[PDB]
Structures are given as structure tokens and as C-alpha cells.
């Protein structure tokens, strides 16, 4: 259309979801210059799949989703098709289908604390891997053995969410990274999110 896509609310949102409770914003009926998105500043990761970044200035999509959350630096690599590990298996999973872009940046200066900030959580245990784009916010006690926990934490009975400790002494593999994942959806419908050229 004519009006500019509201990427600022996603990318500059002051607080980010925990990865296990990752957020999704729908982008519709707008025009999206992706070269400016590159140029916001200083993205440590800007990787795309199924599309060329030098081309979706010329493309339209039915809808565009923007998922955001916080993780450790050395886990950003898990935000890609075909990855495994705690984040990919149990918190946030891209398909092998993925046509979109993964954008991330160091957020030590906003999410760390001197004694560590324990408010960002991830799911450490789950009985099976997440499906693509599935979200799990459940907090059942996790039965790692043969004894029914009955909702109480025991030796083989663990609360499923675990805390990052974001502290500035960490160094980059363990500092927090804000991640934004853009999905480009060609659904059996009109296109509403376009690049400025098309």
C-alpha cells in the first residue's frame, strides 16, 4: 500500500519476551524498506533463507510475521532451519521450509545486571521437540524418572523453566541477544506487505 511497516515497535520494543514465551507481531497492509532495516544499526546477525535480502525490496507477501525474544549469544546459531539444541528443540523451532530472515544483536547494555538478571527464562526440559513455530508456555513439573511428581519438585521432578544469568562479566557467548525473526508468507490471498520498489 502506502504507509510504512511498523518495524520499530518490534525492533525497538523496550522489553523482549523470554524465548520460551516468544512473541509474534503480525505485519500487514504496509510498505517495508528492508534496506533501511539493515541500516537501523549494528546487527550482529542478519541471515535470510529462501529469499535474497537484495530482492524483498521488490516483493510482496500475503502477511509478514515478526517473532522476538532474548537468548544467549552462543544460541543465535540455533535460529535457523535444521538446527538442534535446547532453543531449537524446546523453545522455538524454524521449519526446513523457512523463507524469512533472522536478525539478532547483542543486548548486554539493556538486559544484563551486575549481579546477573534472572528474569529471562528458557525451557530446559520437554518430553518432545517443538514443532515449527509451536509455542509452549506450560509449567508442568517435568518427570525425568519413573515416579509421578504430582506437581511437586523432587529429585527426578524438575520445574521446566531455567534462568539465564545475564551479567556483564559474561562475555559474548553468554550475554543476552535480542532476536527478531521475520517470516514471509505467500498464502492463497492478496499480498499486503510490499517492498518500496516492487
Amino acid at each position, epitope marked *: 500500500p502506502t504507509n510504512l511497516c511498523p518495524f520499530g515497535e518490534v525492533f525497538n520494543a523496550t522489553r523482549f519476551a523470554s524465548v520460551y514465551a516468544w512473541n509474534r507481531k503480525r505485519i500487514s497492509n504496509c510498505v517495508a524498506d528492508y534496506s533501511v532495516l539493515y541500516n537501523s544499526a549494528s546487527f550482529s546477525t542478519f541471515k535470510c533463507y529462501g529469499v535474497s535480502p537484495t530482492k524483498l525490496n521488490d516483493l510482496c507477501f500475503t502477511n509478514v510475521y515478526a517473532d522476538s525474544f532474548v537468548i544467549r549469544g552462543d544460541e543465535v546459531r540455533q535460529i535457523a532451519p535444521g538446527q538442534t539444541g535446547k532453543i531449537a528443540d524446546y523453545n522455538y523451532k524454524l521449519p526446513d521450509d523457512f523463507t524469512g530472515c533472522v536478525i539478532a544483536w547483542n543486548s548486554n547494555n*539493556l*538486559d544484563s*545486571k551486575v549481579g546477573g538478571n534472572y528474569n529471562y527464562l528458557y525451557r530446559l526440559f520437554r518430553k518432545s521437540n517443538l514443532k515449527p513455530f509451536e509455542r509452549d508456555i506450560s509449567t508442568e513439573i517435568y518427570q525425568a524418572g519413573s515416579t509421578p511428581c504430582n506437581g511437586v519438585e523432587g529429585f527426578n521432578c524438575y520445574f521446566p523453566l531455567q534462568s539465564y544469568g545475564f*551479567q556483564p*562479566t*559474561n562475555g559474548v557467548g553468554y550475554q543476552p541477544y535480542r532476536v527478531v525473526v521475520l517470516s514471509f508468507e505467500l498464502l492463497h490471498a492478496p499480498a499486503t506487505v510490499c517492498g518500496p520498489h516492487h
Partner: antibody, heavy 127, light 106 residues
Framework: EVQLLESGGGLVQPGGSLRLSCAAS????????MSWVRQAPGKGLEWVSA????????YYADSVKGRFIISRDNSKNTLYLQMNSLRAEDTAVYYC????????????????????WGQGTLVTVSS | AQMTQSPSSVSASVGDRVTIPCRAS??????LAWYQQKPGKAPKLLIY???SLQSGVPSRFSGSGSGTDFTLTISSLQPEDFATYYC????????FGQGTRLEIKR
């Protein structure tokens, strides 16, 4: 040009009230944490209080908890410091200051450097 | 309660290369600022993130250090550089303390 213009300082008796004001310009005020710093005669700087861009999280120095309130009007690009129950030792020059980095949501979370500083008002608590 | 410690005074002459040591509490990592104050006047941010020169600040000021030992160095002391210098942990608002007085040697 970023500017921070302070007003409201003056002379008040022990127990009184004063309201300080820090008019901000040259930047998107609502995106920056702000703080009040002061310097009593013959002592060193101390953080009085601070507040994130949204206003939703604030910090107070121990010596002033319960007695000072910090606030902002993001509409008017203005920071305030409501001071109650003033004591002699609250006598100081009060500066306001802007956070270098933008986007803090919690006042104890993140890195806090202060690039721009106001000129300061003098507050005198005496009878 | 203060989080950083630097010597009360350092004595220097124009031209000199001056260093100010600073010992921080552990667990600060990177988050160390240097501030300059002339008497009665508002302090000025010189260096942030322990080694980043702040905008508009003369290049003769530089900051280094890792862990808990940091240091501000002034390569070519100008007469306007005599002031008080503070090293400040950039989280939970520690008090400034006495800082380091940069005075003229004699």
C-alpha cells in the same frame, strides 16, 4: 543540540517541600532514562534518583526513599523531582542528566552512562 | 556504598602523560565510565564501556582495563585538564566518592 534546563531550586525550611524541573530538548526524551544527581557543599556527587524512559521503573538513593518522588511528563519533555520533608543535609546543587544509551525498561538493568547534564539548581534547606 | 576506588590525588605538569588507576568491585566486567568535574560544574562523560571515547571528547583521553583494574590515561596534558576525575561503575548508581584530583606538580 541536546539541552537540559533546570529550575525550581531555592530556599526552604526543614520539613518543607520543593519541586525541581528539568526541561529537555534536542532528543526523543521518552526514550531515555534520566536521573537526578546532587552535590552538597564539601561532599562528592551522589545519585539522588533515576527513572527509565517510560517512567515505569524508578530508583531512589537510600537517604531519600519515602521523601522524594521522581517523575516525567513525556508530552512536555520534562523531568521532575518532588522533594518532601527536606533536611538540612539535602542542601546541594541538583543536576539532571540523560542516559547515553536508549531503551532501558528496568532501572537496575543495563548500562548507565550519562552524556548530557543540566547546569544545576541550588537547594538550600535552612531556617 | 561506593563501588570503585582511585587515588585521592595525582600530580602532573602540562605536556605530561598521565595515568589514573581505578580498582573496581569484581563483577563489573565492561561497565566502567570515566567522568571529569571542574569545581561547582556538572561532571562530563569522558569514556564509557571502559575504553570508548565519548562523542566530542579530545582524543588525548583514553580508557583501558579488564576485570577489576581500569585506568584513564591522558597522553598530552593541557592546562584545562586539571580537574577531578571519577571512575564509575555504570550500573546501580554507586556514589562518586572523592575521585582523583589532578593537580599541578611543583
Amino acid at each position: 543540540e541536546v539541552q537540559l534546563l533546570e529550575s525550581g531550586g531555592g530556599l526552604v525550611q526543614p520539613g518543607g517541600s520543593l519541586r525541581l524541573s528539568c526541561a529537555a530538548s534536542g532528543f526523543t526524551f521518552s526514550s531515555y532514562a534520566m536521573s537526578w544527581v546532587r552535590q552538597a557543599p564539601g561532599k562528592g556527587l551522589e545519585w539522588v534518583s533515576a527513572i527509565v524512559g517510560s517512567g515505569g521503573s524508578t530508583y531512589y538513593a537510600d537517604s531519600v526513599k519515602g521523601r522524594f518522588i521522581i517523575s516525567r511528563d513525556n508530552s512536555k519533555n520534562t523531568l521532575y523531582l518532588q522533594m518532601n520533608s527536606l533536611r538540612a543535609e539535602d542542601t546541594a546543587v541538583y543536576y539532571c542528566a540523560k542516559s547515553l544509551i536508549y531503551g532501558h525498561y528496568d532501572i537496575l538493568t543495563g548500562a548507565y552512562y550519562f552524556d548530557y547534564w543540566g547546569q544545576g539548581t541550588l537547594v538550600t534547606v535552612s531556617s | 556504598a561506593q563501588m570503585t576506588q582511585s587515588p585521592s590525588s595525582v600530580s602532573a605538569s602540562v605536556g605530561d602523560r598521565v595515568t589514573i588507576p581505578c580498582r573496581a568491585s569484581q563483577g563489573i566486567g565492561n561497565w566502567l565510565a570515566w567522568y571529569q568535574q571542574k569545581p561547582g560544574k556538572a561532571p562530563k562523560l569522558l569514556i564509557y564501556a571502559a575504553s570508548s571515547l565519548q562523542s566530542g571528547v579530545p582524543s588525548r583521553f583514553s580508557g583501558s582495563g579488564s576485570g577489576t583494574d581500569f585506568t584513564l590515561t591522558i597522553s598530552s596534558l593541557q592546562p584545562e585538564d586539571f580537574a577531578t576525575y571519577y571512575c564509575q561503575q555504570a550500573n546501580s548508581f554507586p556514589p562518586f566518592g572523592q575521585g582523583t584530583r589532578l593537580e599541578i606538580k611543583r
